[PDB]
């Protein structure tokens, strides 16, 4: 009973990282409804705070078990549990900033356990990340496809800026089950991540995400599966 995916699941997360050489750690806890595609988390900076950069570059690194999938697509990442999966991401921002991430996901004692390692580099001094001028992510579409025995996703991800401008990243992620799992074909995932509350210096932050997979081929019949 401590090794299955219930309709309500909690998670714990630890992140160690650096951005432009500034080392930090985060610990958090979350919860959500994996088959509905919804989740929330509360994150706390436990080393290196206050962070001298925008929280928003970290927020997408805190949970793909909580994606609502069509009934006729193998839910590769759910299927990988309890052992779980690993993911690796590269984000290329339009001003030369780069974020690379690796992550381990497992199911232990009835909760998901996430361990994240992050390296952000080359953010410019007069850009919005190092000056905390961002204001959350627009909804995204992640184009998923199998490749080389893993599941890949690509996103053109748009960060809102306080001045009404926008700031784009190109993102690629590899998601790989720890044991062999049947891979899906290509499909898309619609995602929206919100920061629902935070303290003044973003050392305590609450997030919400909704994510839903959809077929990208198959005509009307493959809609709303």
């Amino acid at each position, epitope marked *: *009973n401590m*090794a*299955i*995916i*219930k*309709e309500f699941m909690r998670f714990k997360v630890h992140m160690e990282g650096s951005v432009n050489g500034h080392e930090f750690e985060i610990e958090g806890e979350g919860e959500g409804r994996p*088959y509905e595609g919804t989740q929330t988390a509360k994150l706390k900076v436990t080393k290196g705070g206050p962070l001298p950069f925008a929280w928003d570059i970290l927020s997408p690194q805190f949970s793909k078990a909580y994606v609502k*999938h069509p*009934a*006729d*697509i*193998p*839910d590769y990442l*759910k*299927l990988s*549990f*309890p052992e779980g999966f690993k993911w690796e991401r590269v984000m290329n921002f339009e001003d030369g900033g780069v974020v690379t991430v690796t992550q381990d996901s497992s199911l232990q004692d009835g909760e998901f356990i996430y361990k994240v390692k992050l390296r952000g580099t080359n953010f410019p001094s007069d850009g919005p990340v190092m000056q905390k001028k961002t204001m959350g992510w627009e909804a995204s579409s992640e184009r998923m496809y199998p490749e080389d025995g893993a599941l890949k996703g690509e996103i053109k991800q748009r960060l809102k800026l306080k001045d009404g401008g926008h700031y784009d990243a190109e993102v690629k992620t590899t998601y790989k089950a720890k044991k062999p*799992v*049947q891979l899906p074909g290509a499909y898309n995932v619609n995602i929206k991540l919100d920061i629902t509350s935070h303290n003044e210096d973003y050392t305590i932050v609450e997030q919400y995400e909704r994510a839903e997979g959809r077929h990208s081929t198959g005509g009307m019949d493959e809609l709303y599966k």
Partner: nanobody
Amino acid sequence: QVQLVESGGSLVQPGGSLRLSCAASGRFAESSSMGWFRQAREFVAAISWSGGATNYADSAKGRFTLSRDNTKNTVYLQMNSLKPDDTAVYYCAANLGNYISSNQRLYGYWGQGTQVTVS
């Protein structure tokens, strides 16, 4: 696609035992987690696609056992200590999301049912 074919329903005596089967076929049979529901629908027990996790409704725990032959994508529900009120049509259903709990709406593929009578 996943197709499910059940077998094994029979008449047994009170206190008796039976073994039901459900064979999954189709492109996603290897990824099919299978759950049994009975309709006199109510959850009975389920087993993950890998055969490695099982979950039993309260009334089934300790007297029923589920197993999976991964080479045939077939599951077996061994029912012991059966009583008249276990009489029902037993359905097996499947999902591709590693779900083995009681919400029937999370199983999108259904077998045809098999009749168990205890009397």
